[PDB]
Amino acid sequence: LMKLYSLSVFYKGEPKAVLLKAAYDVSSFSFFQRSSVQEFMTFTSQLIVERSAKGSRASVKEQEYLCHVYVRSDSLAGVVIADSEYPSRVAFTLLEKVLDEFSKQVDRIDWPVGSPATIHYTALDGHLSRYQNPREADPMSKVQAELDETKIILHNTMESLLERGEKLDDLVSKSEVLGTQSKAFYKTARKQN
Numbered sequence: 001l002m003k004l005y006s007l008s009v010f011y012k013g014e015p016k017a018v019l020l021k022a023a024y025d026v027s028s029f030s031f032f033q034r035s036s037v038q039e040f041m042t043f044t045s046q047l048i049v050e051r052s053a054k055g056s057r058a059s060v061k062e063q064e065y066l067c068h069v070y071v072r073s074d075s076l077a078g079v080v081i082a083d084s085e086y087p088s089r090v091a092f093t094l095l096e097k098v099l100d101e102f103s104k105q106v107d108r109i110d111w112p113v114g115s116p117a118t119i120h121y122t123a124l125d126g127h128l129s130r131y132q133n134p135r136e137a138d139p140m141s142k143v144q145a146e147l148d149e150t151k152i153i154l155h156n157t158m159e160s161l162l163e164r165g166e167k168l169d170d171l172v173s174k175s176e177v178l179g180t181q182s183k184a185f186y187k188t189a190r191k192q193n
């Protein structure tokens, strides 16, 4: 009930989003799916950052999932993938807190050519784990009053983020973030439903 599946920090370059650090909880999935589900959440998180404007907050609905993104004006972006029922208000609180703490710890000179292997920030697995229970959300009331007056862009499908002549299938096919198993898993899941 009400799960968080991934939390990741990106540098938003044009056009490419650079993954800096990611945390996942794929334990509710079958053992054989876990590696693929992780890759697809990284792939999904990367694409949402790239198609989102700087200084904007958005929620992307797909299946029973909700992907919340905050791309800041300084080019740091955070993505949390959750179940739709998880309260969006607290998800953005989560993104606000991690991007703050990350930018305080990790100098922006490391962002444009950074990668998980070269970025030392270990806190991400802790925040995801702690936010599994919304009741233990770190309450900044000052950003809460800020978030209340903050608008969020709703995308009803992943189709909403892409261009008019763009299929999700081609981006999946050509992906460098997705392994061959992931791409297959996507292709069979498209066939079945």
Ligand SMILES: CCCCCCCCCCCCOP(=O)([O-])OCC[N+](C)(C)C
Pocket (backbone or CB within 6 Å): 028, 029, 033, 037, 040, 041, 044, 061, 062, 063, 065, 067, 081
């Ligand atoms: C918006 C993009 C987010 C990535 C979505 C990846 C989903 C891949 C589906 C893989 C097939 C599994 O089937 P399912 O019934 O979903 O089992 C999952 C049930 N739990 C949620 C409880 C674990």
